[PDB]
Write an enzyme that holds these catalytic residues in place. Structure first.
Site, PDB file in Angstrom:
ATOM      1  N   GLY A 157      -8.240   3.120  -2.606  1.00  0.00           N
ATOM      2  CA  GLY A 157      -8.228   1.675  -2.496  1.00  0.00           C
ATOM      3  C   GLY A 157      -9.496   1.032  -1.964  1.00  0.00           C
ATOM      4  O   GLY A 157      -9.498  -0.161  -1.662  1.00  0.00           O
ATOM      5  N   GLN A 170       2.570   3.022  -0.449  1.00  0.00           N
ATOM      6  CA  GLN A 170       3.618   3.119   0.561  1.00  0.00           C
ATOM      7  C   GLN A 170       4.010   1.751   1.102  1.00  0.00           C
ATOM      8  O   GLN A 170       5.155   1.566   1.530  1.00  0.00           O
ATOM      9  CB  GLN A 170       3.178   4.042   1.693  1.00  0.00           C
ATOM     10  CG  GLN A 170       3.002   5.478   1.271  1.00  0.00           C
ATOM     11  CD  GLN A 170       2.670   6.386   2.425  1.00  0.00           C
ATOM     12  OE1 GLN A 170       2.574   5.944   3.567  1.00  0.00           O
ATOM     13  NE2 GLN A 170       2.476   7.663   2.134  1.00  0.00           N
ATOM     14  N   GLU A 190      -0.016 -24.234  -6.286  1.00  0.00           N
ATOM     15  CA  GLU A 190       0.005 -25.283  -5.268  1.00  0.00           C
ATOM     16  C   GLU A 190      -0.484 -24.761  -3.938  1.00  0.00           C
ATOM     17  O   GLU A 190      -1.064 -25.514  -3.150  1.00  0.00           O
ATOM     18  CB  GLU A 190       1.405 -25.860  -5.059  1.00  0.00           C
ATOM     19  CG  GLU A 190       1.832 -26.944  -6.008  1.00  0.00           C
ATOM     20  CD  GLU A 190       3.155 -27.574  -5.605  1.00  0.00           C
ATOM     21  OE1 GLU A 190       3.825 -27.022  -4.710  1.00  0.00           O
ATOM     22  OE2 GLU A 190       3.507 -28.639  -6.157  1.00  0.00           O
ATOM     23  N   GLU A 225     -14.857   5.147   7.728  1.00  0.00           N
ATOM     24  CA  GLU A 225     -14.351   3.786   7.554  1.00  0.00           C
ATOM     25  C   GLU A 225     -15.348   2.649   7.784  1.00  0.00           C
ATOM     26  O   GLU A 225     -15.194   1.618   7.110  1.00  0.00           O
ATOM     27  CB  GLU A 225     -13.123   3.559   8.436  1.00  0.00           C
ATOM     28  CG  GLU A 225     -11.876   4.141   7.868  1.00  0.00           C
ATOM     29  CD  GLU A 225     -10.678   3.797   8.703  1.00  0.00           C
ATOM     30  OE1 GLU A 225     -10.867   3.273   9.818  1.00  0.00           O
ATOM     31  OE2 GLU A 225      -9.544   4.014   8.234  1.00  0.00           O
ATOM     32  N   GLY A 245      -4.093   3.077  -4.184  1.00  0.00           N
ATOM     33  CA  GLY A 245      -4.336   3.698  -2.902  1.00  0.00           C
ATOM     34  C   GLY A 245      -3.051   4.176  -2.251  1.00  0.00           C
ATOM     35  O   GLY A 245      -1.944   3.766  -2.605  1.00  0.00           O
ATOM     36  N   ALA A 272      -2.392   3.543   0.867  1.00  0.00           N
ATOM     37  CA  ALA A 272      -1.936   2.360   1.585  1.00  0.00           C
ATOM     38  C   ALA A 272      -1.145   1.448   0.667  1.00  0.00           C
ATOM     39  O   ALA A 272      -0.061   0.983   1.026  1.00  0.00           O
ATOM     40  CB  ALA A 272      -3.128   1.622   2.183  1.00  0.00           C
ATOM     41  N   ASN A 276       5.108  -1.192   7.967  1.00  0.00           N
ATOM     42  CA  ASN A 276       4.970  -1.760   6.629  1.00  0.00           C
ATOM     43  C   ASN A 276       6.155  -2.586   6.154  1.00  0.00           C
ATOM     44  O   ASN A 276       5.947  -3.519   5.375  1.00  0.00           O
ATOM     45  CB  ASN A 276       4.684  -0.661   5.607  1.00  0.00           C
ATOM     46  CG  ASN A 276       3.324  -0.057   5.792  1.00  0.00           C
ATOM     47  OD1 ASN A 276       3.174   1.147   5.902  1.00  0.00           O
ATOM     48  ND2 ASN A 276       2.320  -0.907   5.881  1.00  0.00           N
ATOM     49  N   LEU A 303       2.513 -21.006  -6.381  1.00  0.00           N
ATOM     50  CA  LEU A 303       1.413 -20.124  -6.022  1.00  0.00           C
ATOM     51  C   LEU A 303       0.067 -20.639  -6.491  1.00  0.00           C
ATOM     52  O   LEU A 303      -0.959 -20.098  -6.067  1.00  0.00           O
ATOM     53  CB  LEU A 303       1.666 -18.716  -6.563  1.00  0.00           C
ATOM     54  CG  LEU A 303       2.408 -17.740  -5.637  1.00  0.00           C
ATOM     55  CD1 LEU A 303       3.827 -18.161  -5.324  1.00  0.00           C
ATOM     56  CD2 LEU A 303       2.419 -16.356  -6.242  1.00  0.00           C
TER      57      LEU A 303
END
Ligand SMILES: CC(=O)O[C@H]1C(=O)[C@@]2(C)[C@H]([C@H](OC(=O)c3ccccc3)[C@]3(O)C[C@H](OC(=O)[C@H](O)[C@@H](NC(=O)c4ccccc4)c4ccccc4)C(C)=C1C3(C)C)[C@]1(OC(C)=O)CO[C@@H]1C[C@@H]2O
Ligand SMILES: Nc1nc2c(ncn2[C@@H]2O[C@H](COP(=O)(O)CP(=O)(O)OP(=O)(O)O)[C@@H](O)[C@H]2O)c(=O)[nH]1
Ligand SMILES: Nc1nc2c(ncn2[C@@H]2O[C@H](COP(=O)(O)OP(=O)(O)OP(=O)(O)O)[C@@H](O)[C@H]2O)c(=O)[nH]1
Ligand SMILES: [Mg+2]
Ligand SMILES: [Mg+2]
Lengths: 430, 426
Positions: free
Chosen positions: A137, A15, A245, A174, A10, A12, A219, A243
């Site tokens: 996305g 970027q 845990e 959306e 995507g 989003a 961002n 990750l």
């Protein structure tokens, strides 16, 4: 070992990742060519001599933004096998991006992943960046996470989705992208995020005090949130939170997997010299309603389980002292049957920020990721926005001929309807 | 020569031990390579209890260093006394327990358990006649509990007639650092009762109060919280390494202080405990030390000694003393505080005097008391357990690794019966 993969589906996702990989090359001392004039085996793989390549497969259905990467400064880190480019996008349609157009090129991305996945032996997880208001996305990822989950069994998968606001929203259909992406939210990702476009625009002018917040400063702040989950793989520390845990502390139930991030110190460039930004303060900064990545207040919804992930010059004695005060508070209240809701990791590195960025060079940091009950009220803002457009059967005719049918639209409503209903069930005590 | 072999299972166990082997070396004059550079010959008379002399005039630690992750190992190697360890001993996987009990007990360590179990059989033959199993771990995470409970029940198959020493840090309500601390206790209740002979219970809670107040210190780091536990474990094993007038080794303590087959949970104690300032304002002697020993604020298990009785205390003195002075102080307290001791056991104290103190003092001690107030520490965990299981919360991370509903129903009755014995005989 300990390696994991990024997929940026995507506009989003790219970027965001256009700065997420700006950040990591900055951290490890890696110039954008791939050269490092130890740690980096979470996202990289050294090839040859003096070359580092990422786990970066960028997927798109339209050749505009990827060519910017291919002409930007980061064209040399990436190599042109990686960057999958489509022809003509979904254009904010679902049944184009899932049923029609992505059927051509999704065979090209999976057999690009496995030439990157079977090169590492320490497979940790996935970082699939997208939005809930795109067309790329939106429902193409709903095809893609029903491909890697068939391939990779029960490995960890992490999607970082940008979520639509009630007021500031820049598209029309959306309320149709978000209801259909839920079938690959409860079923094909085990730690699913929500980040608002609204709630960060309040932070860029009140905490950082900048009058013009655009996407390249909306961002860069998300890049610091991603860079703090992975401080425990890429680096050492007094307490470390792997990750896997991470999810066992955090996620309390087989379906509730919706944390929300926040971060501190988000302070301005010259407000640092006067604020006494201490361990008792930046822990206390994580409970203000003006430090939410999602437009919701932490007060009307009760917490369940947060996971403090610090970084920097922090000793563990006063983290207990800072968390002693927060337990004595009366408005910050928890669900009662989880009598401890605290998990603390510590990195030894200094958190760093981008030259030419907007944040201040500090020597401590905190990244809370709380699971809570307030964010189901960040769904009734959007169930209402769906509730009237289908009531007059608006915009149905772009989907019928493209693959999508009516009977799923009444069916994908219960996919959200029961999901708000279950936080009501497990939020109440007895 | 009554040897002791040493296992460290988990990050805390791998960091308590990494200073425990630092404190135990400078008693014996071990350099950072492995050779002897001590001063007294009484070190080398029993050097072979924690050591094997490797050829060339060097010594090695009889220690087996277990994780499931290479991260703690790297700190062990690159830290203090890394090179002295034998590199065949580091038996570790790559996956990670994930702070799951069932991942360190059914899944990941369960296919590394034999590769641990044959480095100890090599260390079971460098010895004349072993007796000691020091296991240092937690009750907090995955490698401490599930990798540290399956491993004991395998050593019981080889050795039904040795003595087992866990050193088990407990979960506290104040400092609760993880979320599933109540799930890393009740599962490990079931086989630290019926398969260990003694179990020291140390807490993170009370071990900070010794650092802020009694030592007058502002920054308690773990390398100080460990460095108290190191000097307790360096004290119970003093008769195996040094002569003394009234001597008492590891079985000789464990036969006097343990009156029942199950009630064998201890709490440590150490004196002197002074700041860098209150040194000159103190005069070291037996009434100086013995009164500090019996204080309510010198018990590392976070409970009040005033809220219960002791059943069988014992003190392990060190340093050149006189016996009556030590005899009368122990005579004093059973006379002074006769309400705080059990009424149907006379002569609660078992003294032990060693002729050698810790290095560079005039004297020191080590207290161990099998109190009744341990009944409170499990209620602080049994009620934290009671909420989380009643909703069946966090149950999907455990059913997905092989566990069952049945493993949680019976395990509560085991922790029910344990507090049912301190209270019944208090
Ligand atoms: C001038 C002087 O007398 O200084 C003392 C001292 O001031 C005090 C305060 C010491 C000091 O201890 C500490 O401050 C300490 C720090 C971390 C953890 C625990 C203690 C001392 O550092 C510790 C040190 O201990 C030893 O030398 C023992 O042999 C001890 N050794 C170690 O723990 C050790 C430390 C570093 C490297 C290698 C070993 C020991 C105890 C039991 C079993 C084996 C060894 C001593 C007496 C002193 C100082 C130097 C200030 C005390 O501790 C000990 C273990 O003796 C704390 O209360 C006692 C009372 C002592 O009087
Ligand atoms: N007194 C000490 N307590 C410690 C130390 N290191 C950790 N801990 C405490 O122990 C608990 C964390 O346990 P661990 O790191 O040992 C869990 P372990 O590595 O054994 O298994 P995993 O679940 O695989 O991480 C928690 O209460 C810590 O605050 C230490 O050096 N000293
Ligand atoms: N935070 C953030 N949001 C962005 C960015 N770019 C786009 N968005 C948001 O993403 C949504 C629009 O989706 P896009 O990602 O542009 O669309 P797409 O995924 O490319 O799908 P199609 O173009 O329809 O194929 C809107 O809510 C935008 O506000 C960005 O850089 N940062
Ligand atoms: Mg697009
Ligand atoms: Mg561990």
């Amino acid at each position: 070992m300990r390696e994991c993969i990024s997929i940026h589906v995507g506009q989003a996702g790219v970027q965001i990742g256009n700065a997420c990989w700006e950040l990591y090359c900055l951290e490890h001392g890696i110039q954008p060519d791939g050269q490092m004039p130890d740690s980096f085996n979470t996202f990289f793989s050294e090839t040859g001599a003096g070359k580092h390549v990422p786990r970066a497969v960028f997927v798109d259905l339209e050749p505009t933004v990827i060519d910017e990467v291919r002409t930007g400064t980061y064209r040399q880190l990436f190599h042109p096998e990686q960057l999958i480019t489509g022809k003509e996008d979904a254009a904010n349609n679902y049944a184009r991006g899932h049923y029609t157009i992505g059927k051509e090129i999704i065979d090209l991305v999976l057999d690009r992943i496995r030439k990157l996945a079977d090169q590492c032996t320490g497979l940790q997880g996935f970082l699939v960046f997208h939005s809930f208001g795109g067309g790329t996305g939106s429902g193409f990822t709903s095809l893609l996470m029903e491909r890697l989950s068939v391939d990779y069994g029960k490995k960890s998968k992490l999607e970082f989705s940008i979520y639509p606001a009630p007021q500031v929203s820049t598209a029309v259909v959306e309320p149709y992208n978000s209801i259909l992406t839920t079938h690959t939210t409860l079923e094909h990702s085990d730690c699913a995020f929500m980040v608002d476009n609204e709630a960060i625009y309040d932070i860029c002018r009140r905490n950082l005090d900048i009058e013009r917040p655009t996407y390249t400063n909306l961002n860069r702040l998300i890049s610091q949130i991603v860079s703090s989950i992975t401080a425990s793989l890429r680096f050492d520390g007094a307490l470390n939170v792997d990750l896997t845990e991470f999810q066992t502390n955090l996620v309390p139930y087989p379906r509730i997997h919706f944390p929300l991030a926040t971060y501190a110190p988000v302070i301005s460039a010259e407000k640092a010299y006067h604020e006494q930004l201490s361990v008792a303060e930046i822990t206390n900064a994580c409970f203000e309603p003006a430090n939410q990545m999602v437009k919701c207040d932490p007060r009307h919804g009760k917490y369940m389980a947060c996971c403090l992930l610090y970084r920097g010059d922090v000793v563990p004695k006063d983290v207990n002292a800072a968390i002693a005060t927060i337990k004595t508070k009366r408005s910050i209240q928890f669900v009662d049957w989880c009598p401890t809701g605290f998990k603390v990791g510590i990195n030894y590195q200094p958190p760093t920020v981008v030259p030419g960025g907007d944040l201040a060079k500090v020597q401590r940091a905190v990244c809370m990721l709380s699971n809570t009950t307030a964010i189901a009220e960040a769904w009734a803002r959007l169930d209402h926005k769906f509730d009237l457009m289908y009531a007059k059967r608006a915009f149905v005719h772009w989907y019928v001929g493209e693959g999508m049918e009516e009977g799923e639209f009444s069916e994908a409503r219960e996919d959200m309807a029961a999901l708000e209903k279950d936080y009501e069930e497990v939020g109440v005590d007895s | 020569m009554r040897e002791i072999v040493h296992i460290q299972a988990g990050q805390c166990g791998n960091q308590i031990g990494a200073k425990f082997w630092e404190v135990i070396s400078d008693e014996h004059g071990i350099d950072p390579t492995g050779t002897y550079h001590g001063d007294s010959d009484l070190q080398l008379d029993r050097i072979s209890v924690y050591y094997n002399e490797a050829t060339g005039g060097k010594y090695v630690p009889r220690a087996i260093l277990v994780d499931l992750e290479p991260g703690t190992m790297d700190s062990v190697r690159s830290g203090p006394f890394g090179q002295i360890f034998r590199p065949d001993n580091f038996v570790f996987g790559q996956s990670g327990a994930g702070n799951n009990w069932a991942k360190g007990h059914y899944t990941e360590g369960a296919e590394l358990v034999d590769s641990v179990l044959d480095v100890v059989r090599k260390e079971a033959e460098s010895c004349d006649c072993l007796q000691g199993f020091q296991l240092t771990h937690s009750l907090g995470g995955g490698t401490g509990s599930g990798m540290g409970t399956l491993l004991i029940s395998k050593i019981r198959e080889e050795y039904p007639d040795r003595i087992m020493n866990t050193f088990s840090v407990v979960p506290s309500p104040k400092v609760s650092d993880t979320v599933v601390e109540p799930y890393n206790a009740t599962l490990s209740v079931h086989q630290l009762v019926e398969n260990t002979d003694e179990t020291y219970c140390i807490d993170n809670e009370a071990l900070y109060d010794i650092c802020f107040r009694t030592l007058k210190l502002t920054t308690p780091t773990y390398g100080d919280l460990n460095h108290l536990v190191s000097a307790t474990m360096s004290g119970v094993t003093t008769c195996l390494r040094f002569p003394g007038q009234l001597n008492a080794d590891l079985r000789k303590l464990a036969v006097n202080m343990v009156p029942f087959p199950r009630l064998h949970f201890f709490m440590p104690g150490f004196a002197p405990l002074t700041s860098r300032g209150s040194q000159q304002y103190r005069a070291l002697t037996v009434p100086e030390l013995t009164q500090q020993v019996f204080d309510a604020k010198n018990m590392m298990a976070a409970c009040d000694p005033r809220h219960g009785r002791y059943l069988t205390v014992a003190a392990v003195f060190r340093g050149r003393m006189s016996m009556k002075e030590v005899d009368e102080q122990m005579l004093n307290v059973q006379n002074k505080n006769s309400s705080y001791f059990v009424e149907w056991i006379p002569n609660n104290v078992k003294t032990a005097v060693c002729d050698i103190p810790p290095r560079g003092l005039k004297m020191a001690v080590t207290f161990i008391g099998n109190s009744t107030a341990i009944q409170e520490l499990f209620k602080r965990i049994s009620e934290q357990f009671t909420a989380m299981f009643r909703r069946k919360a966090f149950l999907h991370w455990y059913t997905g690794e092989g566990m069952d509903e049945m493993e949680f129903t019976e395990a509560e009755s085991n922790m029910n019966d344990l507090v049912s014995e301190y209270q019944q005989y208090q």
